[PDB]
């Protein structure tokens, strides 16, 4: 009965997303209790038809009724008010912002796909004596000396001394899971761990949303400048398995195009994944080598071309 | 899904539906009154029709005046 | 009131007998006026 | 007008303190500390709804009661010249088409074509302002 | 004794009486009527886009649309339906019965009504002329977020002309926000107090205070990025607040517009409830107080579109979507108490004002979901918003729009709209729009972001796809019966003879001839309280109407 | 024509008795004006989250205000909306020529303000500071040649009102187009005091 | 003096300001629209060519039916130049009556040709389109002034 009064909401696969689940469940049955009740008064109302019987003589013809007005705007007030209590409760649980990740993955998503960098691992029981590289992030500071004038001038560049081609924001990682477009990315997670999302984008807003995480952010251009919190984290994730995410903001003509994977594998598999990757491999060898499909099982790298009736 | 099943569903159901409602509603008596059958008697109230054909001297009623009836002809018939 | 009602004789000359009337084109007499609808629906 | 400039006084109230508010809790307890967007757009609002409301009020207080204002009001009290309202006028489509040419000019970024809609509104709005204005023909 | 009447009404009018009215037509009647004629035809203009949205959308391939095609698609429907049917109608019935309802003869600067409309027309069709440039149409989304509306993302002229396109039909709803305001506060009848006129009055009152402050903030918006694409004026550059500042520039825009484009047909559903339920407004000053309430509170809650950005104070704006959730909730509950303990008789106008009620609270329930973070992380820019919004928007401006036609059509026209065929249309209407979009709660909560040109088969939810298209081909015919029914009703149909139509009228519109005198009124009767015209056409009624007001 | 239907000495007279009622031409114009203050609103919101993103240095090394002709221009403009109340005094009479005297030397300080500001644009263009070449300059730029745009606006309108002047009877309908031209000009210079505080000395 | 049974009120000026229940109508004809139409055009522009004001009188005409018909001919707006055409069926009676200023314009020749059109029909069973060829007939007989 669960899943069907959810209204297809996905049985969540992290405790924050379980705690969401049962936030929304708790919500749509008061809003089905309200809908129902409404909805009778309605269809009640609607048995006072223009009776023939009616004669010569109109209705009470009252309206203004202070003290039901007073009760059904008190009422309301009280049930927004515990909704929104219970709100509060459950938003502290989206992002605890835990100082000890468990493993930390650096989400950047670029025009129509995305790519994840394994920031840095550091497992609680004691392992993956792990890294992220950044070498590679190089400024783009326009200071040189004189400009197209022949002195005063001496422009440093037009945001905070910079240039709007930066891409200093961005984070490179030593393992990237890019996706191509025609092989769907697949970030691989080890179940039962913290992971953290250091969120990001490369040129424009869009938004990564794991539908079973039940839980999504938008990843922004210069999210710290934005005043943007695009790093989130999740607890835990129980169930394992390959989980379908999306994006679910508006990237350009191939928006729908994004489709990417969070395979969720043992901590066993991930410590061999990763070893394999710092070995000279791709993610598709990697799982192969893990003994998991190598493409994405949930979605496809569907047709590049524009569409059916175009002729190849 | 069965493109050619999807195809036929989207055009057809709302044909069909279109239908059942056209047949239980433009199907109904409408409040215009039946046309009055010569047999049965005249019981709606006098009708008086005026063409508005020509232009009435002056728009407004004041100055008009009531010079008469002046009839100028007549006939008469029984079906 | 700074104007003068004005007035004219204008040469006429068919006699726009068959064809439009002043009610549904008020200067029909004054110009070229009604052309036949075979002719738009041709 | 003492109900027209209540109206906006109550919705400065409610902008001033939503502005307040805001700038505070946003300041303390943001990313960024203050928006700087909401908070000027909540500021200027209340700003909008302050002169309106201001403005109300002169007119309230330098005003007696109308009969629109006044309960109790027969039609005859009203019953007089009612202004100017203008009757037809055709420079209003002028000015509408002027103004989709400078903006067409500001679209597709063509300077020539924006100088031209800015000279066709001048000349439209002109035309507007001065159609009851215009004198007749000297000769 | 006994008049001399025409057989029937005449049913068109003579050659060349039309034309050039319209072009300087000051009469604030007719340009209400250019308005909702114009209006409708941006509503099926808009609408046709969604049924190429719907088919494509039936199958998980790309079965005749592209990527880009599919986006210009819910970019120019969505800014269509909003910004030029939407918006552009509410002073198209405000220009309709607004002077009607307060006893003016005319708005008050009604060459400057004449401007807006024209503003409106023309503004509208360089937006939607962004489809002819080879490029296409805009491709961003109607809300234009700011990186992917630079120069460098969508380069075309088609996004350009869409923001010159909404700043000219902006200005236009700026200047008939003037009108309708200054209309109110300055030209109202002898005896007509504030707290006396109508609620659709009241609520276009509020309606343009909300224009006034929200409209100039997009055009502002809109400059800023058009001075970014034009001169890389680096306004809305990711680096400095540009991400964020265009979506709080928007939205305090943007939910405004979502209001204005609500308090009015509150109002005309609020018009035909009293006069069907023969009963007076329930709770008249209470409405005019949640009117008022909900204005104040829109404009401090924009930013609850901008949840999942994580960069705005999350619980400041979820609070205040709660508390403005309570005004429209009294809203709802004195629309129940008009039509409680009333001779209710369905027509077409209560028929289409009861479906407002029912697809209307749907919509609100889900939009109170909406309200609260974490259950809108999940399902934010989802089809359960599209679902959302939909249920709101069609439930208010399209269910209580066509109630405000029907039940206005006579008061314009003079003729009297089919009931058989507008109860054809409705149920059309009701039963193709549940089909379409109550699926889409579903559809959206699973995996399916909005905005999706294309989808996998492996992917689910095909089956609620085509369900959805089925819907929507139901309510594409839909259409089909409404236009028959204004187009043989505006020169045939049963004429009305008589002011109210519809008996026990209110507002003082129903007490003109139905076509009304140019001047709106040939007789003002004695206005003594929110009911002058149910005053003068049943004097028995007035002291009753005092009596058992206050009982309740 | 024996005198006439409409006994009114003007054509075009006021939309209602000013004595007694609201002006309704002066309550929608101050409507208006209450909209283009949210437009420099979303201006201002601009600035400041450029303001706010700079890295404490708000006006870059390149930029250098010119205060010493910032000011001049600023009081030129406070010196124009007073002059400009004084024609609306003389508007309230029916002194035409006086109103005419004021609104022309309103006008010409306008214009003059205009091109002092025109002159501190080319003077900051070829000092770096441009809208392609900065954030600052950008937003800075934005926000003065709207408010520039605006004040061509008045300027445009203040002639227009004297050429009406100049064709017909002064009346009180022609007043109170004076009138509202002025609330205009009174709501540039506001926005000006408000622009120059913020960019200048708030900076 | 009353006013209608019921919401029918006498404003400040002459005018009364009737409503109707909103299931039922005003006019309340007993003709289709259509052919009532039909009707309006002929007395709108098949009389045009007469440039006399034809009228149809359905209602019922007791006692003298010709001096019935001119005191009813007396309401037209203008009976100077004006052709009325009563026709009782509680009496199964057509009277036409004429204006002084339409005489000799072939009315008087053409009053025979519509009442035989007229009666024709009705003995059919068509009071509409028998009012319809009468309006015809006439008006092609009447002469413009
Ligand atoms: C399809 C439908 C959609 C059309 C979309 C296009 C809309 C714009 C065109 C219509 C504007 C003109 C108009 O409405 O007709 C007025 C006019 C009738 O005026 P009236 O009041 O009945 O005159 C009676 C007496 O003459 C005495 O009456 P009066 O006292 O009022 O005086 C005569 C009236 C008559 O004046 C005129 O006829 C002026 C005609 C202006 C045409 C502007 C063309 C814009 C291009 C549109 C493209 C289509 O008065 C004047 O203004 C004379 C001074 C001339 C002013 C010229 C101003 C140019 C403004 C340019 C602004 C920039 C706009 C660019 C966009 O109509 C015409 O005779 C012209 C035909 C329509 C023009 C077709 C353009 C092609
Ligand atoms: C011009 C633009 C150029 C391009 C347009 C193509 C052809 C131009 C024709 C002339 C336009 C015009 O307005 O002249 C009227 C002209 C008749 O000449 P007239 O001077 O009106 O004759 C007096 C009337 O006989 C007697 O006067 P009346 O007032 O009784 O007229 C009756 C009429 C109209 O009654 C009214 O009072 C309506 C007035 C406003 C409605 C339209 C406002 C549009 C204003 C925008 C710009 C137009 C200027 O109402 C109806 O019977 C129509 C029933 C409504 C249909 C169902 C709607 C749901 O209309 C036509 O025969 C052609 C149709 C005009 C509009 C259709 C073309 C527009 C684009 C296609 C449809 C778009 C849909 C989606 C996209
Ligand atoms: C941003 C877009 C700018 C929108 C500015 C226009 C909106 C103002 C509407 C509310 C003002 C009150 C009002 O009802 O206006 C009366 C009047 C409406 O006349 P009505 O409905 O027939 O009733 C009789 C009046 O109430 C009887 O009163 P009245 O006719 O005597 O009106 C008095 C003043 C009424 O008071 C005002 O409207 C103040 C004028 C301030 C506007 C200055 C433009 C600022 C924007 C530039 C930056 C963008 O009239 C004047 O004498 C001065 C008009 C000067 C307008 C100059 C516009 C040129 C724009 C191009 C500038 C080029 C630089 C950019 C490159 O509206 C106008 O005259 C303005 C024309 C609309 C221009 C739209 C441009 C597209
Ligand atoms: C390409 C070649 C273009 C050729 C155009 C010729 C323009 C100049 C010749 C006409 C001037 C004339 O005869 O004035 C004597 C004329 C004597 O007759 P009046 O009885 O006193 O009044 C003139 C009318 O007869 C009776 O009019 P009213 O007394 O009823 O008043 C109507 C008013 C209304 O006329 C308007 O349209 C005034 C509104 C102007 C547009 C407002 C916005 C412009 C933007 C402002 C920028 C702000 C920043 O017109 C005036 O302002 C009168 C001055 C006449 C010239 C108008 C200026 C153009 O006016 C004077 O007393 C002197 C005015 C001198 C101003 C002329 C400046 C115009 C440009 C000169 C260079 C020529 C173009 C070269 C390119
Ligand atoms: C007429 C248009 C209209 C109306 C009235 C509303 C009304 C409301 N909207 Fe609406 N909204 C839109 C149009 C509208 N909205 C549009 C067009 C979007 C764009 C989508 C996007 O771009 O994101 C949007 C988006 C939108 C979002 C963002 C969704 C997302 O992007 O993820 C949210 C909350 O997050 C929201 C909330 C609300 C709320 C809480 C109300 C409420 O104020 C009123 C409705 C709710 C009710 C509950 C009313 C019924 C109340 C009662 C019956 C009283 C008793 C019941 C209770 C107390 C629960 N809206
Ligand atoms: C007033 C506002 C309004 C209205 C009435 C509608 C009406 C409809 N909308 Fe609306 N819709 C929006 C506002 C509106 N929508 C907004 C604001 C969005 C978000 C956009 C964004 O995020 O960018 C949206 C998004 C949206 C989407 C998501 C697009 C995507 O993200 O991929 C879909 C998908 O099916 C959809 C479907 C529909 C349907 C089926 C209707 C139907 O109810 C429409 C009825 C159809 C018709 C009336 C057409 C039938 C008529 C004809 C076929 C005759 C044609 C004749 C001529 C053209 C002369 N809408
Ligand atoms: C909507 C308009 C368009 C979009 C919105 C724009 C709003 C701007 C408003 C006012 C700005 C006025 C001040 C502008 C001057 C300030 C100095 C400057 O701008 O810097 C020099 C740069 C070159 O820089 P460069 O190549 O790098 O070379 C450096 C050399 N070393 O010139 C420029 O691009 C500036 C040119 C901009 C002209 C804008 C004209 C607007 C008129 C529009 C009319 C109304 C349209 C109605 C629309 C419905
Ligand atoms: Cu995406
Ligand atoms: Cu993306
Ligand atoms: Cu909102």
Known sequence: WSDALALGWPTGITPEAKLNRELWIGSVIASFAVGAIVWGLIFWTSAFHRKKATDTELPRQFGYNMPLELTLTVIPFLIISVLFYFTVVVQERMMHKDPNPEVVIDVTAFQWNWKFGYQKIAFADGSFDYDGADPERKEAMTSRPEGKDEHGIEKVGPIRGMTPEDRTYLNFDKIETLGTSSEIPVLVLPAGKRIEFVLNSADVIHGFWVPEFLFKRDVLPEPKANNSDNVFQVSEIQQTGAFVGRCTEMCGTFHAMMNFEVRVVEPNDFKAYIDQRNAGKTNAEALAAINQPPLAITTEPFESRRGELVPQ | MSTALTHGLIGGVPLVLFAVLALIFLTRKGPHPDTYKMSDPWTHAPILWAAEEPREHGHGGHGHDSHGVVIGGGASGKW | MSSTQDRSQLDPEVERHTGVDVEDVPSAEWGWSHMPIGVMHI | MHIEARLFEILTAFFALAAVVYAVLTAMFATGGVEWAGTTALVLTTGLTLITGTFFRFVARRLDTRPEDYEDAEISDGAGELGFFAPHSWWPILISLSFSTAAVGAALWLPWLIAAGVAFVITSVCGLVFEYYWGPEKH | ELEARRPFPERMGPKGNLIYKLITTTDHKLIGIMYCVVCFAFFLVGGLMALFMRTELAMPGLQFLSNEQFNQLFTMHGTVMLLFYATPIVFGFANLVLPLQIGAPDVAFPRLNALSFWLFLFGALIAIAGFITPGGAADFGWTAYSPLTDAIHSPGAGGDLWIMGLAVGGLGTILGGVNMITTVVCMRAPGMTMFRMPIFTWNILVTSILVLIAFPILTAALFGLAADRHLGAHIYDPANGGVLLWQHLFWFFGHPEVYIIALPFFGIVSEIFPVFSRKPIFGYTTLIYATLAIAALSVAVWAHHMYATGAVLLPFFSFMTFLIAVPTGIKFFNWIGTMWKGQLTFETPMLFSVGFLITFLLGGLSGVLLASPPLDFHVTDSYFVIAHFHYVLFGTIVFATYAGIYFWFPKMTGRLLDERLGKLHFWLTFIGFHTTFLVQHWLGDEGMPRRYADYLPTDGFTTLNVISTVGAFILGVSMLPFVWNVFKSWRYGEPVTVDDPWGYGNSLEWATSCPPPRHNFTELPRIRSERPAFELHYPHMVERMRAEAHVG | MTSAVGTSGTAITSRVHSLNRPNMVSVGTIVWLSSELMFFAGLFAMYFTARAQAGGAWPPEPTELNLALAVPVTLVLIASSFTCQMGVFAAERGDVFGLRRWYVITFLMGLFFVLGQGYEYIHLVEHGTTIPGSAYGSVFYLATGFHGLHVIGGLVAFVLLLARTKMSKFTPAQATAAIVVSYYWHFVDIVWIALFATIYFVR | ?145
């Open chain 7, 1 to 145: 003096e009353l006013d209608l049974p019921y919401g029918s009120a006498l404003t400040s000026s002459g005018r009364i300001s009737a409503v109707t229940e909103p299931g039922e109508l005003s006019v309340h004809y007993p003709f289709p629209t259509m052919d009532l139409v039909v009707l309006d055009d002929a007395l709108k522009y098949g009389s045009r060519a007469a440039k006399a004001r034809f009228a149809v009188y359905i209602g019922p005409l007791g006692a003298d039916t010709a001096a019935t018909a001119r005191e009813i001919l007396a309401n037209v707006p203008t009976p100077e130049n004006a052709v009325l055409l009563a026709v009782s069926p509680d009496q199964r009676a057509i009277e036409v009556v004429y204006g002084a200023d339409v005489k000799g314009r072939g009315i008087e020749s053409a009053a025979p040709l519509g009442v035989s059109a007229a009666a024709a029909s009705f003995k059919e069973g068509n009071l509409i389109d028998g009012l319809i060829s009468a309006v015809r007939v006439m008006s092609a007989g009447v002469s413009p002034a």
